[PDB]
Amino acid sequence: GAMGDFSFIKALQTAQQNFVVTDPSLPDNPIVYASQGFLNLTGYSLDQILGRNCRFLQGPETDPKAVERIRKAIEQGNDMSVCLLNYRVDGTTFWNQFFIAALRDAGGNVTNFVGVQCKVSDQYAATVTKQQE
Amino acid sequence: GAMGDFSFIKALQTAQQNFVVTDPSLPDNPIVYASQGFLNLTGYSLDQILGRNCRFLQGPETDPKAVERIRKAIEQGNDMSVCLLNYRVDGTTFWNQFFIAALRDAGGNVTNFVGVQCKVSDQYAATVTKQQEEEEE
Ligand SMILES: *[C@@]12=NC3=[C]C([C])=C([C])[C]=C3N([C][C]([O])[C]([O])[C]([O])[C]OP([O])([O])=O)C1=NC(=O)[N]C2=O
Ligand SMILES: *[C@@]12=NC3=[C]C([C])=C([C])[C]=C3N([C][C]([O])[C]([O])[C]([O])[C]OP([O])([O])=O)C1=NC(=O)[N]C2=O
């Protein structure tokens, strides 16, 4: 039973609270801050996270074509998105649809990236990957 | 058959988020960084934003009780989820659902705030302010 019973108000607030911030000033664009939401999704504690590129969430069966695409996406310094196979701290798997935006200072330089992460269904993942031509 | 699930909506909802960063170390906690999404939604250019407390988005029909709760949260270094009525640069209004995330330095002082903002519906706003007040009883 799912059809009537969707709580879009909690869903939306949850949406706002799963994120990381990265610092492309630093080498390999590490995560430097992370939300509690992100902790709960991934299962990793802060100490295992900050200082790294969140490509650590990737693993064996992650699509490299997709990874390639999103790195290409981020390269000019702009706002793109992607769905990727991601591994929890316990090795379990989940689809991660996430959206990356650049933060800019008074010089119009990208100081930081912010990324909101959304766990999504196999069905969703099929869809978004099928639409690749 | 009937294809789809909740995660499709969640995905759509997270795609509507945009971001700012403020600096409470500075006077009056001004915006210092912003994403393109924040400019589009509000209508202001980057130049017109950076350096201002983002209360400039507020106006005459903004719930003052809500604004004050925000101020309390900020003073205490707490996170805060809230829906406000904001005004674009052109005068038009919209409901702003946003999450304020406290950020600390190594001394454990608040040095930044991260803001995730979101345009939401009259129905959303209605329901949410309605869910408040009850909470106050
Ligand atoms: C990670 N989300 C995420 C969040 C931000 C703000 C940024 C800038 C990147 C991501 N990534 C992508 C990752 O860091 C990396 O850019 C890609 O792997 C492609 O580049 P490489 O160097 O590996 O070729 C995220 N990747 C994820 O797997 N999950 C996320 O949530
Ligand atoms: C502004 N969003 C927003 C984002 C962050 C990260 C922070 C710290 C604050 C906000 N505000 C609140 C506003 O700046 C101000 O701090 C409050 O009004 C506090 O009370 P006072 O009485 O000092 O004004 C935002 N307010 C909005 O209206 N819209 C935003 O997007």
Q: Do A11 and B15 touch (CB under 8 A)?
A: no
Helix (H) or strand (E) holding A55: none
What spacing in Å lies between the alpha carbon of A31 and ligand 2's midpoint?
25
Among B52, B55, B82, B113, name the best residue to mutate to test ligand 2's pocket (greatest count of ligand atoms within 8 A of Cβ).
Answer: B55
- Give resolution in angstroms: 2.7
| CATH topology (fold) of B1-137 | Beta-Lactamase (3.30.450)
**Tokens 């106006």 — which residue?**
B59
Structure tokens at B37: 């999404």
| Beta-carbon contacts of residue B63 (< 8 Å; ≥ 6 apart) | B84, B85, B129
Q: Where are the domains of chain A?
A: 1-133
Neighbouring CB atoms inside 10 A of A110's CB total 19
CB A62 within 8 A of CB A103: no
A26 by DSSP, 3-state: which?
coil
The top-level CATH class assigned to A1-133 is: alpha beta
User: What is the residue type of B31?
Assistant: I
What's the 3-state SS for chain B?
CCCCCHHHHHHHHHCCCEEEEECCCCCCCCEEEECHHHHHHHCCCCCCCCCCCHHHHCCCCCCHHHHHHHHHHHHHCCCEEEEEEEECCCCCEEEEEEEEEEEECCCCCEEEEEEEEEEECHHHHHHHHHHHHHCCC
Q: Do A112 and B33 touch (CB under 8 A)?
A: yes
CB B16 within 8 A of CB A132: no
